[PDB]
Chains A and B, each alone.
Chain A
Amino acid sequence: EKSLHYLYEENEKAQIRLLEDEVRRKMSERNDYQAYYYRPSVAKYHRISKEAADELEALRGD
């Protein structure tokens, strides 16, 4: 019964390993999810520069 329990645990670990390999392959195929296989491109600096350029329109004067 100890070998039966260890075989059941190792078999379930094998199925979860195969399923996470499939999930990681489908995630790297499409680059969909935000955890792995995702390059975070941010426009924070573009919005900061646009806000600064909008702020310096008020500063234009004499």
Chain B
Amino acid sequence: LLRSKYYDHPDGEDAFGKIVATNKYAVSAGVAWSMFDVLTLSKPQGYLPTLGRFAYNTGPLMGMATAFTLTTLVATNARGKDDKINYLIGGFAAGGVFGAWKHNHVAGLCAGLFLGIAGVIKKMSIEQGWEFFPNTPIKQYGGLNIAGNDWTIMADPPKNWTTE
């Protein structure tokens, strides 16, 4: 249940696996930023405001994640089309939720434009079939003359393997 991905099922197929996947990415990002937060800038003292800063920096990211996933599922299941503007609506909704945590209306839309751009680019990646971070098909372990670069003084004993 906790190992579910976002794209193991199509859009609108299951809700809970998408909520768990996007929320666990939000929890990982919030914990990774909060560990660098409370030790470097605005360092709190005591057990209670440290956990308060952890909740304040993690839970709003969870709210952005679940709001984007919920309005993405609503825009997907409200019609028959599965296209990139549902991801645009979800990015606008996540930006609007982020704005509420900011308490600035301008921040919410300004965030929704960039999150919708990220959503339509990710949906373009899903539709076309390429990856953001693929494995390298070519990995140059060294240059040419890689067998003749052995500048060692020790004489080689005769090998125990042949090609015959």
Contacts and interface: CB of A to CB of B under 8 A. Distances in A.
Contacts of A24: 138
B159 interface: yes
| Majority SS at the chain B contact face | loop
A40 to B, nearest CB: 6
Contacts, number: 46
Nearest to A42: B150
Contacts of A44: 152, 154, 156-157
A31 B144 CA distance: 14
A40 B137 contact: no
Contact of B157 (A38, A40, A48): A48
A42 B160 CA distance: 12
A45 B142 CA distance: 22
Interface in A3-62: 24-25, 28-29, 31, 34-40, 42-45, 47-48, 50-51
Given A28-B139, A37-B139, A43-B159, 8 more contacts: A25-B138, A28-B140, A34-B147, A36-B142, A36-B146, A42-B150, A47-B160, A50-B157
Interface of A: 24-25, 28-29, 31, 34-40, 42-45, 47-48, 50-51
Shortest Cβ-Cβ A-B pairs, 3 listed: A47-B157, A28-B138, A44-B156
5 contacts: A25-B137, A28-B139, A28-B140, A38-B141, A44-B154
